[PDB]
Design a protein around this ligand. Structure first.
Ligand SMILES: [Cl-]
Ligand SMILES: [Cl-]
Ligand SMILES: [Cl-]
Ligand SMILES: [Mg+2]
Ligand SMILES: [Mg+2]
Ligand SMILES: [Mg+2]
Ligand SMILES: [Mg+2]
Ligand SMILES: [Mg+2]
Ligand SMILES: [Mg+2]
Ligand SMILES: [Mg+2]
Ligand SMILES: [Mg+2]
Ligand SMILES: [Mg+2]
Ligand SMILES: [Mg+2]
Ligand SMILES: [Mg+2]
Ligand SMILES: [Mg+2]
Ligand SMILES: [Mg+2]
Ligand code: NA
Ligand code: NA
Ligand code: NA
Ligand code: NA
Ligand code: NA
Ligand code: NA
Ligand code: NA
Ligand code: NA
Ligand code: NA
Ligand code: NA
Ligand code: NA
Lengths: 119, 195, 65, 56, 49, 81
RNA sequence: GGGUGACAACCCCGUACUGAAGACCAGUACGCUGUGCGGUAGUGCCAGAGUAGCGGGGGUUGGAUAUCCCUCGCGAAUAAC
RNA sequence: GAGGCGAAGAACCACAGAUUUCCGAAUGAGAAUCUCUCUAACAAUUGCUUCGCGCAAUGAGGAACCCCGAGAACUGAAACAUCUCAGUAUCGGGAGGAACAGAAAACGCAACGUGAUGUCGUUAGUAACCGCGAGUGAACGCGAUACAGCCCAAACCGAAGC
């Protein structure tokens, strides 16, 4: 919420989470804030996911600004438990990155395009 | 490359700047309405906690403790004293606020032992610390090669004997050289002159 | 006559109980005779009634009665 | 009225009684506190270093 | 006053403690045991009840 | 683990209660109620108990005064034991 | 050394010698199983913050401008440090 | 005094077991050692948790010793205030058979040197403090005792785990 500057409509979040599941199976994903952070810094991140229910906010709050200076686009998801499940985990995940979008690569670019429009 | 953890660390170098400042200003509002000792499900500073031995695992517990700021809450002499001993206002306790916080947490959790603690900031009237405690009786701890030392009988009530990290620093044990003549091996064996 | 420990072990669990009851009864009657005072056939008997009772209860516990 | 013998006549009040915990007749039945062992005040037993000479 | 059952037991015991050393105990001990030192009078002494 | 009946209380007052009132007197465990005394007396002596009166005495024991039904004869019951 | 109706190596217990057990040393030492130590070159990838440090007020110390500690305020660098 | 036990090996001693009332940290609740009830209670705090007191923990004691806090005054200075008595007495909290300390952001006989810690002997009433009065008072080193060195956090891995 201090790190959240724009609102994502449920439909967008649905499409992004869907894209994430397919990118999981047909492509590469990083789960967890440390691995996500690494991929932004290493440049291998295509799309970055960040949950809004993260307590404390410290875990994830560096991500937007970091992603911005690495040119990596990012999207907000409401509950970390969905983000973790979408990424293939029994537990939640505060952040995730798509490294290889796989078959969802067309959809990823479009979701990126939709979010830049949310500014 | 930088760990994500390094970002939490870096934020906390300046608690009155940037996003963290906003965070604190919001959070403290809730903290001031909370009790003396509050068990929290996750550490506010994850880097510091892991640095201090915290693991996300059964039998590891974190609690945030509020303690009043400033000097000794001290009653004035009720009988004869030489002038040197008549003070009230400027007298300060020999245990730092952090150790007070650690003792209050440990008392709240009589079965648990204090591993370590760290500062989460302060308002004008009080300071908050988060204290990591460990269940010495839980087999997830008893089998952890990194934490199982704390299960030994001689580690019972470690905080109250000054065996904690804040305990040891506050006892003047930091230096191995000059200045430590009256602290090591203990304040008491040196006749209470260490501080 | 003295009740030995092998004889107590040779008893069935129900024989020990019935022997326990009998021994209590003799004791009760001995303490009744005493309360009349009421000289006994021998005072050495009440003492032995107590140890026999103790023995049986010990064996009952040992055997799992 | 004299504070001596004449005032001794009014003392029919029971205070200190045999204590359940230590057995001393120190249990003050009005305070519910034992003055000898601390029962009713303290879970720990009442004890003081001044009860003996300092060096023993 | 009004005694409780426990108080009553304690008073009962103190009365029992007021017995003499039995004659036969003096014979058994060759008179090494004669006086009862805990001997208590209701008037002259004071109980803890 | 304690028994109810300790022993008959045998004194002159007890004899008068036995002869004239059809009552038996016992030293009983001070933890025992009147009902428990009535029962125990019935089970041991094979009689019928009409009434039990109790007293905690200055000997430190409980004394029970147990009146027997007319079908029972106290002096007879007492003479057995 | 003691006992025994009075000064006892030889009257009795014991005492020297030799031997046995338990406890502590110690779940230690030795032994063993698994693991794998280390070196060169390249690489600013990592290395613990209200900290180090400074100021106000106190306590403490032999610690003196150079002890250790508390309290209020301020406050770094990143091993090329 | 009476009476009993023991060759069915008693007494007695060692080890192991059984029994072990009530109060007592005292824990279902109350109570000067007793009582009450839904035969029902780990009370209270807390960890895990099949979220059920299901599995566990704490409480209190102990001759002093040990560690962490609070901390006088008589007295000495021939008065007395800093100083001294003294971080003593006493108080609060807590561990163990010992405790605490402990593998250098050390030392600084300055070195081409020493090499975790404690303790003992010495260094030395030396350096240092102090109405520079009275008093106070180390350390490095050395000779000994005993010796023992290691694990994380992070980087890089990323569920390979408990
Ligand atoms: Cl938060
Ligand atoms: Cl503790
Ligand atoms: Cl050297
Ligand atoms: Mg304890
Ligand atoms: Mg020591
Ligand atoms: Mg007066
Ligand atoms: Mg008394
Ligand atoms: Mg009488
Ligand atoms: Mg009545
Ligand atoms: Mg001083
Ligand atoms: Mg109770
Ligand atoms: Mg003077
Ligand atoms: Mg003076
Ligand atoms: Mg002078
Ligand atoms: Mg001094
Ligand atoms: Mg030095
Ligand atoms: Na505790
Ligand atoms: Na000091
Ligand atoms: Na009297
Ligand atoms: Na009787
Ligand atoms: Na300061
Ligand atoms: Na016993
Ligand atoms: Na318990
Ligand atoms: Na439970
Ligand atoms: Na003088
Ligand atoms: Na004077
Ligand atoms: Na001075």
């Amino acid at each position: 919420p201090v790190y959240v500057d724009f609102d994502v409509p449920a439909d967008l979040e649905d499409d992004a989470l869907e894209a994430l599941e397919v990118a999981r199976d047909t492509g590469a994903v990083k789960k967890g804030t440390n691995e996500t952070t690494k991929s932004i810094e290493r440049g291998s991140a295509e799309l970055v996911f960040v949950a809004e229910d993260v307590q404390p906010e410290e875990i994830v709050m560096h991500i937007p600004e970091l992603a911005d200076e690495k040119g990596v686009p990012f999207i907000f998801v409401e509950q970390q438990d969905d983000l973790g499940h979408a990424a293939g985990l029994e537990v939640g995940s505060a952040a995730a990155a798509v490294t290889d979008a796989g078959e969802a690569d067309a959809d990823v670019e479009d979701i990126a395009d939709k979010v830049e429009e949310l500014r | 490359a930088r760990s994500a953890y390094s970002y939490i660390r870096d934020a906390w170098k300046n608690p009155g700047d940037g996003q963290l400042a906003e965070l604190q200003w919001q959070r403290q509002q809730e903290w001031r309405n909370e009790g003396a000792v509050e068990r929290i499900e996750r550490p506010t500073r994850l880097d510091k906690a892991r640095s201090q031995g915290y693991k996300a695992k059964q039998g590891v517990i974190v609690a945030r403790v509020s303690v009043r700021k400033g000097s000794a809450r001290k009653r004035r002499h009720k009988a004869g004293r030489r002038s040197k001993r008549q003070g009230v206002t400027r007298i300060t306790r020999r245990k730092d606020i952090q150790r007070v916080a650690e003792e209050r947490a440990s008392r709240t959790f009589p079965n648990l032992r204090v591993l370590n603690s760290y500062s989460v900031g302060q308002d004008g009237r009080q300071k908050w610390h988060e204290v990591i405690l460990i269940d010495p009786n839980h087999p997830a701890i008893q089998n952890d090669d990194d934490l199982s030392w704390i299960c030994a009988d001689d580690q019972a009530d470690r905080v109250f004997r000054g065996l904690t990290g804040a305990g040891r620093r506050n006892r003047g044990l930091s230096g191995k050289g000059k200045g430590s003549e009256k602290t090591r091996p203990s304040l008491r064996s040196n006749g209470g002159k260490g501080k | 006559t003295v009740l030995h420990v092998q004889e107590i072990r040779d008893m069935t669990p129900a024989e020990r109980e019935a022997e326990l009851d009998d021994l209590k009864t003799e004791l009760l009657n001995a303490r009744a005779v005493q309360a009349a005072g009421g000289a006994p056939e021998n005072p050495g008997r009440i003492k032995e009634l107590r140890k026999a009772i103790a023995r049986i209860k010990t064996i009952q516990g040992e055997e799992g009665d | 009225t004299g504070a001596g013998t004449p005032s001794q006549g009014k003392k029919n009040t029971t205070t200190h009684t045999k204590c359940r915990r230590c057995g001393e007749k120190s249990y003050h039945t009005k305070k519910k506190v034992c003055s000898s062992c601390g029962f009713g005040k303290s879970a720990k037993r009442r004890d003081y270093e001044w009860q003996s000479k300092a060096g023993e | 006053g009004k005694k409780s059952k426990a108080t009553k037991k304690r008073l009962a015991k103190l009365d029992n403690q007021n017995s003499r050393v039995p004659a036969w105990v003096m014979l058994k001990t060759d008179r090494e045991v004669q006086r009862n030192h805990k001997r208590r009078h209701w008037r002259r002494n004071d109980t803890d009840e | 683990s304690w028994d109810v009946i300790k022993h008959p209380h045998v004194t002159e007052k007890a004899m008068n209660d036995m002869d004239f009132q059809n009552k038996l007197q016992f030293a009983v465990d001070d933890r025992a109620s009147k009902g428990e005394v009535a029962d125990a007396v019935e089970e041991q002596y094979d009689v019928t108990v009409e009434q039990v009166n109790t007293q905690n005495t200055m000997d430190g024991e409980k004394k029970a005064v147990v009146r027997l039904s007319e079908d029972d004869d106290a002096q007879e019951v007492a003479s057995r034991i």
